[PDB]
Each structure stands twice: as C-alpha cells, then as structure tokens.
Amino acid sequence: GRVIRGQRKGAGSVFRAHVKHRKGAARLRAVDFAERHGYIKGIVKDIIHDPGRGAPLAKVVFRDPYRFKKRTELFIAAEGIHTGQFVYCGKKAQLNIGNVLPVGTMPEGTIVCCLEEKPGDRGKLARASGNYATVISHNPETKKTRVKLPSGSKKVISSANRAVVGVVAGGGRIDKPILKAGRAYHKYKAKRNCWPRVRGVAMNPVEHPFGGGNHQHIGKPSTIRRDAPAGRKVGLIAARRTGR
Template identity: 75%
Template sequence: MGRVIRAQRKGPGGIFKSHTRLRKGAAKLRSLDFAERTGYIRGIVKEVIHDPGRGAPLAKVQFRDPYRYKMRTETFIATEGTYTGQFIYCGKKAALNVGNVLPLGSMPEGTVVCNVEETVGDRGALARTSGGYAT
C-alpha cells in the first residue's frame, strides 16, 4: 500500500483561462462575393500587428466595398514577406503572388498555400499556424 504524495494532495491545479480580451480580432478571409468570384478586388495592407495568444502576425487589409461607398478592413494571417503598403488582390483572376487570395483550382499543382478554406465561403480553416503551409 503506497501513500498519497504531497503533489497529489494539493490537487490538479487551477483551471487555465486564456487571456482573450487583448486579442486583435478573428483572422478570416474576405467573405466570398460576386466581385471575388468573377474578377478580383484590390486591398492595401495598413499594418502588420502582433496578436497575443497567436504565433503568426496579423495583417490589417483595407478594401473598397464594391457595393457601397465605404472602406472595409479585414484581418488576414500575414504571409511571409507581407509589408505595410503592399497591395493584396483577392479573386479568381488575381495574379499568383505571395499574399494574394485566389481559388486552389487556378493555382498550379505544388504551390505552397496557407489559410485554406475547407468548404467554399468558410473564410479559412486549414494551414493557419505560424509557419504552417499546405501544398
């Protein structure tokens, strides 16, 4: 018959609570609309920021709303080499460059991608970690 040691008597410890109030926002792709399905839309990186609780930096990208006289700001996961003032193109006819958002069907096989949608319109679900990618 053994004995219960001091660490076991003290218990399992406290419940971990993540400090979420300091977060900068959810990192998602643009919602899929007509402008993105048929052509492309241009955005500009306003700032690259650090998000507490996440290893990957975030990029605040500002787009002109194609339907209203308004500017919309989206929070993307920043790819390697993203800088402030960079143009980001989103859509079917966007060029294949680092940071641009385009459908997997229009990319050649073996292209390194990140933040991939699992189903159309879910705004990014796969390969979202810092330094993570899919081919």
C-alpha cells in the first residue's frame, strides 16, 4: 500500500512548523556569575503575542555585566506582569511573581513555571499557556528536589536550576470552544499543516490500515502494541485501559 499520513510527517516539507512570524525562542537567561551568586536586574520593555502560542512573551532588557551593552531576553511573562517592571534574576532574588530564582533557594510549595529540566538549558518545563509546576520537597544532601509537573507526575529534579515564579499568562484558553472550522483553520494555520484530519476508516485500505470494506468499520482491535512497526502503529498506542 501507500505510505500513511503520520508516516509521511517525518520527512517534513509540508508538515514543518510555520515559524515565519514567530518572535524568537522563549528562553531563560543563561547562567553566569550573577545567576549563580547574586542577582541582576532587568526591565520589561513590552509584552508581545507570539504566533502559534497561547502565552504572551515579554521583552526583558538586562545590562551585560562584562561588556557595555543592553542584552534583551525572551521570557514568558507570568499572569500579572506589567511593563516597566523590574524582573530580577539570580540566587539572591526575592520571592515574588515574575522573578526567576533557583528551586533550591525558593521555599517548597511555590507555584512556579518555565522550569528548567537540567541546569542550564534556559527553561523547558511547564510553560505552555496556564500551566505551573509545584515544589514538593527539597534535600540538602546531593542537591535534589521533588517537583510535581502539571500532568500529575512527580519528578526528581536537581536543585541547581531555576524557574520564573507564578503561572503562565493566558490561562483558561481551552475553556472557550472553537465554534468554527474557520477558527480552527486560523488556529492551526499559524502552527503547522496538521488540522484536516481524515479518519482512516473513511480512507481506502491502501493508505491506512483501517480503511476498506462495504461498511465503515475498523475490523481489527484498535489498541496496538508498543512494538508495532511504522505504518502499522495506528490507533490506541499501547492502551492500558480504553473505556470511559
């Protein structure tokens, strides 16, 4: 048969991301002497909307402590961050909203977001539109910390890394329905070509493993194993349960 969709998505070139009008990479400020020992101050110039993202970004300008130059950064502004606000960053930073500081120095129970997974990767976790990670417990020896991710998972992350304080601005975005194929088209047009999703039962049996037959039925069990090959692994990928 043909190569199925999803299997065709790996090559790209029609399925790549629409990264034309996006305003850059939303990354934390990298670690240095000021991040490690003290704190350096920056100003929030403006807040911008990034295409394909439900969260607004914030242009934050710092002064470079080694060369005379105003360094700008792309943070994700917490809900409540206004322009003209002094965002501090480092180890000695005070605990308030929009003030990135390490998890080993913050008290536990702190609602944080834009969390680093490994120390130094400029912010990876819990930073979509309204999500937040919580700090459960610390550990003085070996510098480890327990962090609850917004999926309910509970992860051992080292205490050396940092996160901005608060929730991601733009919460409640999924509470409103789309109401239109047009609004869903405009939503995914800024992201990537993935929205018109033909069900594989309605397809011919040569471009999908569920197509064919005089009636639109699946025919085989839709729950497939993890050890399934490419072009076959279609349906419910290694389902533990499947019902309501």
